[PDB]
Amino acid sequence: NSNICEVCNKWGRLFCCDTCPRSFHEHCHIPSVEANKNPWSCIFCRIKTIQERCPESQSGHQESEVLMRQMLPEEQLKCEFLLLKVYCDSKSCFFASEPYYNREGSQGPQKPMWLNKVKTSLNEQMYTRVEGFVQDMRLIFHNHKEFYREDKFTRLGIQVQDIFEKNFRNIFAIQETS
Numbered sequence: 279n280s281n282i283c284e285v286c287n288k289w290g291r292l293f294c295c296d297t298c299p300r301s302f303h304e305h306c307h308i309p310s311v312e313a314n315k316n317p318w319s320c321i322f323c324r325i326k327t328i329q330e331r332c333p334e335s336q337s338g339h340q341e342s343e344v345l346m347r348q349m350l351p352e353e354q355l356k357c358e359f360l361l362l363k364v365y366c367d368s369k370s371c372f373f374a375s376e377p378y379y380n381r382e383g384s385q386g387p388q389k390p391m392w393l394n395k396v397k398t399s400l401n402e403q404m405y406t407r408v409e410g411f412v413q414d415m416r417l418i419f420h421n422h423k424e425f426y427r428e429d430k431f432t433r434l435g436i437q438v439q440d441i442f443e444k445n446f447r448n449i450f451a452i453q454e455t456s
């Protein structure tokens with residue numbers, strides 16, 4: 279297995295997947311690494327298995343249909359995975375913890391949102407439909423773009439939103455369009 283965490287790319291106390299070469303810090307994996315199991319398969323492997331069990335799951339879907347899906351175990355896992363893919367980008371650090379807003383000429387958002395909050399909400403089974411998770415994720419980037427206005431720092435929200443959206447389309451097999 280790899281000698282660095284798949285998510286944060288650092289060494290440390292690592293847990294190795296038994297079905298692929300990836301390794302993870304306990305709380306870098308989502309869900310947190312469940313240490314009782316042996317064999318243990320990571321989320322990448324679990325997602326691949328869902329895919330292989332139901333090959334037609336990879337045919338194109340409409341975003342509107344995907345968002346209305348109830349958060350049954352398969353969809354819960356897909357949202358956990360999509361969240362993990364965002365954390366895998368180093369620029370997620372800007373969006374991970376609770377923000378605060380005090381900049382001349384701007385007012386903070388009415389509903390602040392951050393990745394660790396989404397992570398807790400998933401862990402606590404607070405989303406009933408994929409829509410709730412996707413709305414909170416999109417809110418993170420929208421809040422950022424609105425607050426930073428014309429500061430070049432606004433670009434960080436565009437960049438991380440693009441990671442989110444590319445991964446959403448992949449994981450939920452959104453129908454390709456131009």
Ligand SMILES: [Zn+2]
Nearest residue numbers: 283286303306
């Ligand atoms: Zn890590």
Ligand SMILES: [Zn+2]
Nearest residue numbers: 295298320323
């Ligand atoms: Zn694996």
